[PDB]
Paper text:
The 2.86 Å resolution map and the resulting atomic model of the N10 double ring show that the N protomer and the entire N10 ring are identical to the crystal structure, with 0.5-Å RMSD over 378 backbone residues and the density of the last twelve residues (380–391) largely disordered. Accordingly, the RNA binding groove formed by the interface between the N-terminal and the C-terminal domains of N (NTD and CTD), and the “4-bases-in, 3-bases-out” RNA conformation remain unaltered. The visible part of the CTD-arm of Ni lies on top of the CTD of Ni+1 implying that in a helical NC it should be situated in between consecutive turns. In parallel, the NTD-arm of Ni+1 inserts into a compact fold of the CTD of Ni from the ring interior and extends towards the CTD-arm of Ni-1. Examination of our HRSV double ring structure verifies the presence of the tripartite Y23-D221-R234 interaction and shows that it occurs inside the N-hole of Ni which carries D221; the loop 230–238 of Ni-1 provides R234 while Y23 is contributed by the loop 18–32 of Ni+1, whereas Y23 on the equivalent loop of Ni points into the N-hole of Ni-1 so that to bind R234 of Ni-2. Thus, an additional tripartite stabilisation of the “latch-bolt type” interaction seems to be a signature of the HRSV NCs. In the double ring, the NTD-NTD stacking of two N10 rings, whose centres of gravity are 67 Å apart, is assured by D1-symmetry-related β-sheets providing two opposing interacting H100 residues and two R101-E122 hydrogen bonds. Interestingly, examination of the crystal structures of HRSV and HMPV rings reveals their bottom-to-bottom (NTD-NTD) stacking but with a tighter packing, with an inter-ring distance of 61 Å and 60 Å respectively.
HRSV belongs to the Mononegavirales order with the non-segmented negative-strand RNA genome fully coated by the viral nucleoprotein N. The resulting helical nucleocapsid (NC) shields the viral genetic material from recognition by the innate immune system while serving as template for replication and transcription by the viral RNA polymerase complex, thereby constituting a potential drug target. The helical HRSV nucleocapsid is a template for the viral RNA synthesis and a scaffold for the virion assembly. The helical NC, together with the RNA polymerase L, its phosphoprotein cofactor P and the transcription factor M2-1, form the HRSV RNA synthesis complex that constitues the minimal infectious unit of the virus. We explore the polymorphism of the nucleocapsid-like assemblies, report five structures of the full-length particles and two alternative arrangements formed by a C-terminally truncated nucleoprotein mutant, and demonstrate the functional importance of the identified longitudinal interfaces.
Numbering used by the authors:
A (entry chain A), B (entry chain B): 2 to 379
Write the structure that this text describes.
Amino acid sequence: ALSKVKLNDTLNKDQLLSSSKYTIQRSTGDSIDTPNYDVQKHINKLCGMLLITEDANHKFTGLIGMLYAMSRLGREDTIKILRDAGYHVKANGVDVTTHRQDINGKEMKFEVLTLASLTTEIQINIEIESRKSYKKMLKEMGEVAPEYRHDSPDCGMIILCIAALVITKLAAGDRSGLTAVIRRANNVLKNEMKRYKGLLPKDIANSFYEVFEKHPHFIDVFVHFGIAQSSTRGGSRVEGIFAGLFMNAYGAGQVMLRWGVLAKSVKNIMLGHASVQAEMEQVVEVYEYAQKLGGEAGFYHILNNPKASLLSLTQFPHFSSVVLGNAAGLGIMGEYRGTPRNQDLYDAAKAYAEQLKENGVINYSVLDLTAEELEAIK
Amino acid sequence: ALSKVKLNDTLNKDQLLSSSKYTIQRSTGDSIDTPNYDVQKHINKLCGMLLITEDANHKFTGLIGMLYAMSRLGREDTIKILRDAGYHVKANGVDVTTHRQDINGKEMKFEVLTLASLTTEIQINIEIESRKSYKKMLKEMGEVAPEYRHDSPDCGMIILCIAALVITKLAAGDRSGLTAVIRRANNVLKNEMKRYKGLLPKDIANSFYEVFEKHPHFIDVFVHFGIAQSSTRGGSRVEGIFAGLFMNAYGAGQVMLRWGVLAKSVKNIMLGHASVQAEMEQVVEVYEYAQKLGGEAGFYHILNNPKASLLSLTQFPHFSSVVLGNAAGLGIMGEYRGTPRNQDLYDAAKAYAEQLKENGVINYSVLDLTAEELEAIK
RNA sequence: CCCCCCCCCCCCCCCCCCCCCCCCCCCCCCCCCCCCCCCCCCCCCCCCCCCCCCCCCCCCCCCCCCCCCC
């Protein structure tokens, strides 16, 4: 039987990768500073002082944001995440210490954290700039409010909202989605931007891009923090904003699967072409693989998961061309810079998709109309 | 019943080989230097110093790359791999030692590893050349960056990417795919080649070819390392590149199975010929055997697995000729130097495959079009 | 190799209920006859017959696999 000449390559590769009986485990490099629940308020305070500082130095904002995420996860969950990702980690306990020094010829007391990644002088400088900005703002408006202060319990999660946007755009492979991050951070979080003068989306976003490029285990820690944060029973409005922006990253790097489902839904005719029909068996294999993976597959491209390549549809040039053409005709492809490699199928699918919007007829069979007196109403 | 005159030779041979109750186990030769997680940073450092050295001596790059792979696997997993492959191994512990010698009439301290395969003088020379190249580059551009240094944590995995390309081309039986390796290593890893002056794809590829020819157990260790590396939850971009290039080796040496599936998919008419139909029963037996093997069968030809011959379709000259002709007509066979041994079936299949691309009609039955007003739109 | 776009979400109105209504109610013990069952005839079996018998070892050719692109 010719119908039995089949190779389930996608499923076979998944079975090969998921039944490995040997494991590697990597070295993160320097010791990882793992804060616990104890210093969560101090890290949030540090984030607030970074936010209330106009022209803030956001060189360490990504590092502090990851510290905040790790303190909300806790030491035990963070360490377990790092083992499960397959990393050798030398965990550093983070505790609060007091430092007295003479700036402006005066003895003043400073409360800092013992971090190998973030030096004490840097934390002192952050606090000093925050104090200068705070007193300037107090002079220029008289009295401060809970809105304008480092004590707000959402100061860390605003920074983590910027981080969530950067995560949504990480699948592009570089800092190319920075403009989209800045735009969406102006639309979302506009009241916050009016609130905090040091909330500079570009600087914070560049800091998070940099920290994710340096430490690829921070991407893992942040994704699992965002899954744990979105697994709560509730929260504040800023935490809801973060959860909404973090689910915006689901399926990032896999737009062609969604656009193929859309091309099927609008019943594009070019899906019936002979070459597309030749590829349908394997494209269906890919879709069954994706829906077998389930929810974990939505962050494969963010995380640089090795099995991300198994979700690709570009190995089906005709189907991919029809899908891209349907997206182009429906006016959703935008500035997507993936290119069709079958120009004729792309053009035909685009033409039909454009024809779809102009036309359109009601299908009365999908309802339960027993008696159709609608003909007389015409 | 004439339909009961059948021999399931492929399944019977597989059952014979998989139910063996006696096992051989071989001798690897010299002692195998098995590094553990401890010296992973040192091996990665050695790889980085090899990469930053223009006109580098890549005679030992394959050996060092295998050392890096074995250190990411660890001593226990590497030793277990070597037992499971059926080898007597005398494992050598690898540890770091300090060596002081007088070069340029100065006492300087050198940090090396105790390897029976790689002598101390060789490691010292690698470090000395790296230092010369580093100072020359520093002079010619002023200040170095994390991009240009041995401390980058991906220096070993770039070398292992070259190794992955060599693995993809190992099924050709010799160093014939070296040009393809060099081309794909220029396309992929182009930013890295701009980054590292000692990244010479030809030299590294020849080193890995040589190490795989000398030690066939390194092929086993590397394949299982690449399966364990692709079984992680995530990583950096270079690790993702490695995983993508290592899945490029899946099914290597078995192109005719994939091309037969493709010939079935495009509905080549010559599959209905009388002789092809005579062979269909056994070719279907081969396909069921492949899909019963599953994912493990994708590396049978790389590994020189004995059961690789059971996946061959060349014992079916007419089916193979139709498959090769379909590939030739579709313009994918390229410079494949397997030859059809039924010229007429090859020519007929090629002619029909060429006819396929020019023609092509939409099959509206595969959609769910309840009402087809498309006839009026023509 | 892969990837590449865009995108927070939400937003209205709204307590519920409201009546009437206990149920039941009569008549009526049941039974009632006739009838033991059985009953004859009949041992069973009965012949013939060992089985087997020829011819015949089997085998015999050819053939590693792979090879592209990504």
